[model samples]
Every structure is written in structure tokens, then in C-alpha cells.
Target chain A: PERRQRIIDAAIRVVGQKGIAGLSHRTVAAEADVPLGSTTYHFATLDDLMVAALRQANEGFARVVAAHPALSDPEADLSGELARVLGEWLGGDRTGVELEYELYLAALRRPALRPVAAEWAEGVGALLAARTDPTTARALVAVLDGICLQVLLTDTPYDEEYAREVLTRLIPV
Target chain B: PERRQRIIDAAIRVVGQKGIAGLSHRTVAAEADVPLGSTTYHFATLDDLMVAALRQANEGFARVVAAHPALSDPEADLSGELARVLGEWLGGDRTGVELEYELYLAALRRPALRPVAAEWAEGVGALLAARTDPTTARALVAVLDGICLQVLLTDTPYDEEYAREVLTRLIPV
Candidate 1:
């Protein structure tokens, strides 16, 4: 069990460092200071390891959202909170977020991975949907994701303030 | 010259059919009904061929925008014309659009390609900016491109009516 946890931790590190395309059992094993046999024993296929890594990222993200008391308070400024969360998620030093994107591209081609991607979308979609109609929530998620795509591509500082302003204009009280 | 055009056409077809990631000299040559040697002779690298294909797509898009008399007429409903143009560009049967997206992804990773992507963004941004402030125009283009990304990823039809309505709401007369 200790070795399994270490392997998962190593996968997170490797994925964050090189992205999903470059992730390999050997890399994870080396990063975790474990043997190759350990990786193979834990995950029979690369897909299995990837799926686990994704799950860990999703769970970690969910925990962050859940721990933020401001996110749950109805009286708090939803737009501001949203912008802050998005900026942090996209701009953070965490390699996991980039790995998450790499996995998203992979999901587009692999049917088996589609559900994982969909579930991640649904989780955020449902949270926003609570405040607005499902249609608007879905659109909001799309817009936010698009912002992430743009931010990742451009080195220009896409600030939290701008994101907050945009969300305020987009979703009115 | 004929072989060069053939290679460009083939690049468009391959990108359209299988998306940008699927394009290669071998695939383009097969699509063009030409030898791989001919493709290499015409374009030295994949990026070179993509640049040509993107130029072609951009010219076609620019022509459509320029030819539509309503686009320039102040009396013409800008939102309606905008929706029409956006829908036409995003909702066509042409495979060239996929190739354009391919270039977009490439531009994100490759700094050398950013100029082309920035030009493409500015072309659309300038048209919208003509009617609104530069900042609003930038946001508008982001939303439009975001909508296109959704359309490509999902099979759902874009709400053209909604697009027109939203643009009208955002831009004041």
C-alpha cells in the first residue's frame, strides 16, 4: 500500500513535469525511487496509470473547492470567487493542471477516457448550475475553459481582476 | 506551381478529415494523389505546408467578411451580420477549419507560429473593434472563438439566435 501511494505520487510528479504524452511507467518508477517491477505490478497498462493520475488531480481540485468557505457562501461574490479560482487553477506552478489538459486532449481520441473528462466537466458545471440555469452554467463552463486555453497559450498576464470583471458582466445578479 | 497547390489542397483535406494532429506529408500526398517525393519537393516541412494552408483559409475568410456588403453598412444590423459570418466560418463543411485549429495548437507550443495566430486573432478582433472599444472587441472575439471550440468538440448546434442576441446586448448603439 505504501509503495502504491508512492507510485501514484510519482505519477503525479512525472505527469506534471513532462505531461501525459511523455509519461511512462519507467519515469514514474524512477521519480518515485521504486523499481520498474513495482510500477508494472500496480498498473498493468499506461492507461490504468493515467486514469489514476487523473482521478488524483480531480480529487485534489475538488478538495480545494470544497475547502474554500467563500465558494459555498451564498452571500459571497460568486464572480470574484470564480475568477480567483480560475486564475489559481491555470496560473499555479502545479504541473498537475497541465497534465490534466494533456489528458483532456488524449480523452478526445480515447473513448474510454471520455467519461472521466465528462465527469470533471459535470462536477464544475453542476456547481455553477446551482446559481443559474443549466444552459447558462454550461456556457459559463465553456467560457471559463476557453479562458484557460487562451491563458495557457499566451505569456501575457491574464489577471484575476480581468477574469472577475468578465464574469461579472457575463453573469449578472 | 501545380504541385504546390496540390500539396496545399491535400493539407486542407487531411486536416479537415482527421484534424491537425492527423496531418503529415505521407497523408497529404495520399490525399492529393501525388507521390510523397512530390510533397517534400513542394514543402520542406509540415509547418511550411500548414502556413500555406492557413494563408488560404484566412484569405477565404477575409473575402467572405469583405464581400458581405452588410458588414460595412451602419444601417445593417451588425449583430445579425456578425452572427451570419461567425456561423459561416465556424459551421462550414470545409476541413480547412480543422487545419486552422491545428495551427492554433501549434502556435501555442511554438513561438514562431504565434505571429500567424496573432494575425488571425487581430483580423477578427479588428472587425469587432471597429464597432466597440478595443477591450470589448477582444472579449467578443474570445467569446466567439470559445463558441467555435465548443461546436467543434461537441455535436450540438450553436445557438445562432442566442449569439446575435448576446452580441447586441453587449454592444450598444
Candidate 2:
């Protein structure tokens, strides 16, 4: 509803369809059906727009993790629960999931995006820590990150049982 | 020695210094100190240059993995050996390692780079499979990928012991 939110939404769509390289104030403005000046006025730099888009995408994932109550249930099976959540995340058309990773991994090149990427890792790690020790939580987050990249990069299907096996190993005895 | 190899070398420098988005025939030509036509002659598309650069980087890492005799030695400590090799790989300036990952992860957005990325995973997985089953090898590769990314993206220091512990868990009894 707000212009800034509208601009962020437009920026995400532009990135999703055209890749991060395709994003620009001009593109965002065109996508949002706003004046070029309006886009720049809301977000002065492309990096600023990218930050908003990445953070927005991350929040979407955070919400998904939050919706999974079993993730925090200590009595629940952590490995199976985690694998199910991954399957859920990887379900349906993967365009949104792919875009989320593209923006997150863009931090590899963009120093400006690195802090936000770290934020995502820390945010998720904190959530997982509720059910496991801090160190194992960190390891789980890393394995999850790795598994997602392998699936996406190799264009392979998400193997939930394999994911569960790998993740189960990460959980300490 | 070869002009194409020179162009590929120059292309890696370009991506390392300026990120993938900075890559172009112009940049490669300038970096290689070649005529503008030389880069375009060998690689007509940016994607071609990226594929060449990524493959070249992958080869460098594969060489490092190959130099370690214990990786394929069934009687060796696979987890310890992997952690040691990872230490060897992550040692030094890390600029090349970062660049390697930047190119590999770039496949997330660029379809043209996906097959090359898959090749690296499969090649490395095959090597590890020499000492373990195929499924575990795949899982090991994923965890290694995850560990490297966590170290790079989070700006965290590599704890070889921690890596060894995680890898050890993945190995079947």
C-alpha cells in the first residue's frame, strides 16, 4: 500500500524475472508503474533497493520457519521436522525460492549485501538454537544452506530422506 | 601459452577484482593486455567466458584435492583428511577461493553456468566416493560446500576441528 513497499515489491519482481543485473531505478519504476524519480526518491541507490528486496525475501522464509511449530518442539524429531520444512520450502514452483537464494548469494560479490546475508544466517540459527545447542544449530543452518544450494545449482530434486540423513548426522547424540 | 588460456586467466582476474557483473570482453581484454578482438575472438559471449573461467577455477581446486593422497585411501581417516584438505584449500589469501565460489554460485542466476557448477560437484563427489559410498559422498560434498560457504559468507574463521567433527558425523560407522 505504501509507496516504499510498492517500490520494494517492484524491485523483487524485477530481480526475480531479470536477475539482479537487470535491476535499476528505471526498471523498478517501469515495473511499479511509477515515475523514475519516484523510485529513486524512495530508494536512492540500487544497493538500497537490493537490501530491501533481500531482507523482504528473508522475512518470507523466516515466516515459513516460524509457522512450523514442530521446529521449536523439543520432543519433536528435529531431523524429520527439518526435512519436512525443507520439502515444504522447496515445494511448488521454485521461482520464489530460487530468487531468494540468488539475492542471498549475491552477497558473495556485493559487500553491501553481506551483512543482510549474515543476518539471515544468524536469524535462522537463533531459531534452530531453541531446539538444539548453539553449535549444532549453526551446523544445521550451514548444512541446510549447503543442501539448498546443491539442489538449486545442480537442478536436482530435493531429496528429503537424504536431507534427513545428512541433517540427522549433524544432530549431536 | 595459448591465447584462449590467456583470455581465461585474464577473465578470472576480472571477475576476482570486479565481480562477475564486471566481466566483459572489454574488461578481459584490458586485463589480458590483448587486443579487444582477441577476447571476443575466443569467447563470443560473456557466458562463454564465465564457463571457461569457472571450469578453470574448478580445475585448480580439483588439482588441490588430487594432490592429497589420503582422500582416496580407504584406510585413511576420511573426516580428518577432508578437514585437513579443506584447511589447505582455505589457507592463504582466500581471494582465489572467494572468486571460485563467486563463479560457482553465480550459476544460481545464470542457466549457462549450471552445468559447469554441476560438473564441479559431481567430480568432487566422485573423488570422495572412492573412500565412501555414493550417497555419503554426495552428502559429504554438500556439507563441505555448506561449510565453505558459512566460512566465507559469515566471515567466520575456519575451525578445522569443528569441520572435522561435522564431517566425522556424516561418516557411517
Best by lDDT: 2
What is the CAPRI rating of model 2's predicted complex?
Answer: medium
- After superposing candidate 2 on the true structure, give the runs of residues whose Cα lies further than 4 Å from its correct spot: none
The DockQ value obtained for model 2 is 0.66
Total colliding residue pairs, candidate 2: 0
Q: What is the C-alpha lDDT profile of model 2 across A76-140, one tens digit per residue?
A: 99999889878877877666567666765577666765755677767778878877888788789
Tell me model 2's lDDT, rounded to 2 decimals.
0.80
Report lDDT per candidate: 0.68, 0.80
List iRMS (one decimal) for every candidate.
3.4, 1.9
Task: Kindly list the per-residue Cα lDDT of model 1 for residues A64-142, writing each as its tens digit.
Answer: 6665557556788877888877766766564555555555545544554454465566677788788666666665666
Docking class of 1: acceptable
Candidate 1 accuracy as lDDT: 0.68
Deviation in Å, model 1, residue B100 alpha carbon? 3.7
User: What local lDDT does model 1 show for residue A123?
Assistant: 74
